[model samples]
Structure formats: C-alpha cells, structure tokens
Target: MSISTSAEVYYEEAEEFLSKGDLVQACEKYYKAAEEAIKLLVIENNLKEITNNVKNKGRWKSENLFKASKLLRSNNTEIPILWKSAWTLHVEGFHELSLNEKEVKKLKEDVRKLVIFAVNSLEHHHHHH
Candidate 1:
C-alpha cells in the first residue's frame, strides 16, 4: 500500500505540465502527488482506520489533505501549512481563470517540498521501527 513510487511519478508528471504552462493539468498531478504522500503517511503510521472514519463521516470522500492534516494535528504532530496552501492553490487554479504563472510555480515548488518531507519522515519512522 506504499505510495512512494506513485507519488514520485505524479510529481514528475506535474513538472512536465508546469514547464508547458499547463497549470490546470499540472495542479491535478500535484494534487495526486500530495494525495499519494498522505496515503503513504497513513500507511506508515497505521492511521488507515482513523482516516477512513474521517472520510466516511464526511458527505463526500477523497479529501486526503484535510484528512491527513486532521490526523497529524490530532496526534500533536507538526502540520505543514505549505501543504494546506498548496491545496488552496490547487482549488483556486481549478476554478479561477486568472491564475498567475508565478503563483502556480510557487505552488508546485511548495508541493514538492511537502512530498519530500512526507517521504523522509516516513522513511525515518520506518528505520526506527
């Protein structure tokens, strides 16, 4: 159930789209990457049931960012605000036609940093466990 590889693939795809000015498509990939990172976090930390319950209680499913952030906060772990901002950027870019290239680029970089942090944290946990 590890999503590390998929996350890297999604990130690479996002980079390709970003280089071509395809903000919408790039954001989709970025979101996918971020979701995969959260998936990996849940798997590594054994928070599957907790996250699943959160999703089930919601009106809809698939808001991995919120679910992950909630789980992290509930555990007294550090929550990455950059991750939240990236989610905002993703949603805004999807709905707004006036997306700025600079903002999109910044979002992409922020998402990459979040992904790396997730992967490293998971790896460190795995090593210690």
Candidate 2:
C-alpha cells in the first residue's frame, strides 16, 4: 500500500496461495512480486545509464529487468540474487512443481527482503539515492 501498488498486491496474493497449499500458484504469484519489486527499483532509480534506452519512454521495464538486474547486482549483490531465486521458483518450483513450501519460503524471504529495499528508499537510507 505504501510503495508500488502491484508489488505488495501480488505479495498478498502469494500469501493467500501459499496458505492455500497451492505451491504452483504460490510460486507464480511470488515470482510476479519479484518482477514488480525490480520494476520499482528501476523506475524509482531511473537507472537509464546502466539500463538501456526507454522501451516505451514509458513505464516499468519488465524485459529490461535483465539489464537493471546487472546494476542492482553490484549495487547490492543480494538484490539480484533475490530475483534469480524467484525465477528458479517459477521454472522449477511452479512449473515443475518441484519445490515444497519450505523451499519456496526460503526464496520467498529473499523477495520480501528485496521489496523492503524498495520501500526503504522512501523511509531509510541503507543505500544512498
């Protein structure tokens, strides 16, 4: 509710699915949260120099999260790791139904940690602007 609207919305959805015992849906929703979290990172930071030209001159860059990932990777190494872990869930955990709830929780906590970074720029300054 405080920052990017969809980021937290999907997070809530993930919790619902997670509690529902639908590992596939839970992983999928949590992976979606990871994307929105990175979108907030790129849009708020305007990482234009590190990321490429505007695909739309526009809104959040879903595709260019790859490029933005690079900047945030070294900017804070674990941030990128968070997304990659979520991606793993989407592929293996959700699609293949390979991951259990506990595995998802491990990765899910990283996504939680990453999204908190988005909100932090507004409140605290663990990293500079």
Candidate 3:
C-alpha cells in the first residue's frame, strides 16, 4: 500500500484505540500516523508543532554539560532547557571555551530578548484578559 493509505489506516486505528481506552495502542498508532504524515510533508516545508516540553529522561544540568546534552535529548521542545544550559555555561566561563566573544555576545542577547519577550507577553495577556 501507499504511504497515504497506511497513514489513513494508522489514523483510523488511533481513533478506534482511543475510543476503546487503549491509550498505549492509540499512542502507537498516532505516532505511526505522524511518521506517515512526515513523509507526505517531506518536501512541503510546512508543519505545526505540538509540544509540552516535558523531559522523557531527566537531569539536564551538571553533575557537568556534555552529560547534560545526552540526558536532554529525550525531551521534545527543549529550547528552554537549551537556553538555560547555555546561559549557565556562559556564566560559569565555559562558553569562551566553545565559542568566541562576538558569537557569545549575540547568543546572550538572544536569550535576554526571548526571556524579556516571554515575560512581557505574559503580563500583557493577563492584563488584557
């Protein structure tokens, strides 16, 4: 069968599994559908993100940072952890070892901007509501 046909099958099975309260099967089928969907969209360069950012593994901090990256990869949308870890490395003087001054400065600015934007957006949303 074609990928599209298989995708449809996975989606239908996922829905059926959900209805039957078989979450494991549902998750499996849903992931299968997603794999097919990825194949279909391979050249489209378009996708929507669905992410909770919770760690599937664990500690992203040192115990040290190489070890942290290994642990962090199990998570989905891990930008926050990445930012935090990067900042920590910078502050602890490890960033100079990895990147030059200009790059580090830009990275620091990006992190600051992201945090400020998130805080401002939160405040504005709460105030407007």
Candidate 4:
C-alpha cells in the first residue's frame, strides 16, 4: 500500500528469495532495501550535498550512501548498525558470495528492521511536521 519508499517492495522480494535458499538474490534484495531506506531519508531531509551528486552523476554510489547515512545517524543510534549490516551484505554476501545462510539470514533481518523504521519515520514525519 505505502509504496512511497520502495524499500518495502525490495524487502518483500527479498523474503521470497530467502525462503528459496537463493542467497545471492536474497542478499542483493536485502541490501537494496536498506539502500532505498537511506535514500528515503536523504530525499526527505533534502540532503543536497549528497543528493546533488545523485542528480549530477545519475548514480547512487556507496559513497553517497555513506555520506547520507552519516548525516542521518545524528537522529538515531540504530542507523549505523543497520547500514553496516546492509554494507556487509552488499560486499561479502552479494558481491563476494562468501557469506552463507547463517550470516545472510541474520543480516536480512537487520535490513528489514531498517526498512520498517524508514517507512514508519516517513509516515510520522508527514503526519505532524
């Protein structure tokens, strides 16, 4: 229903992959959900310093994500830990294919937490402020 942030969509797809034991697809989807969550923060907060690069370069590289996440962490302590989980999955699990189900599954749960937080935050932000 609430598709303003596509992190929810990616999270749902990741769940399907996770159930099938497709680690790579699952890892990638989980990572992207986290990525979209961060992207939502950057967009809603108008982080032009980071988003300007996205407009000029047309790519949401990890550098922009790191910068955005750094700025976002000032609002909540949980952000750093969530991003780390997403980052590790992007590198070790999805790209390197080195992480097994044990690691990917745990990280997937963490990514889900981040996505849910992002979507809820947006809803609350819109309601009053």
Which one wins on TM-score? 4
Cα lDDT tens digits for candidate 3, 1-129:
222244457767866875785544454454444334333332132222211121333522222232332332333244335445444543564434343445434443444343333334334334542
Candidate 4: segments with Cα more than 4 A from true spot: 1-4, 93-96, 124-129
User: Which structure among the candidates has the greatest lDDT?
Assistant: 4
lDDT of 2 at 8: 76
TM for every model, in the order presented, reads 0.67, 0.77, 0.31, 0.78
**Candidate 3 Cα outliers beyond 4 Å, as residue runs:** 1-4, 44-129
Which residue segments of model 1 deviate by more than 4 Å? 1-4, 52-60, 74-80, 93-96, 122-129
Per residue, candidate 2 scores C-alpha lDDT tens digits across 21-84 of 7777777778787787787788677787644555555654544675677676556888767776
Cα lDDT, model 1, residue 20: 84
Worst 10 residues of 2 by lDDT: 120-129
Off by over 4 Å in 2: 1-4, 50-63, 93-95, 122-129
lDDT of all predictions: 0.68, 0.71, 0.41, 0.75
Q: Return the clash pairs for model 4, or none.
A: none
Rate residue 87 of model 3 by lDDT: 46
TM-score of 1: 0.67
Q: Write the per-residue lDDT of candidate 1 for residues 59-100, one digit (tens) a residue.
A: 424655566656665543544465676677656654565656
Please report how far candidate 3 places residue 7 from its true position, in Å.
Answer: 2.0
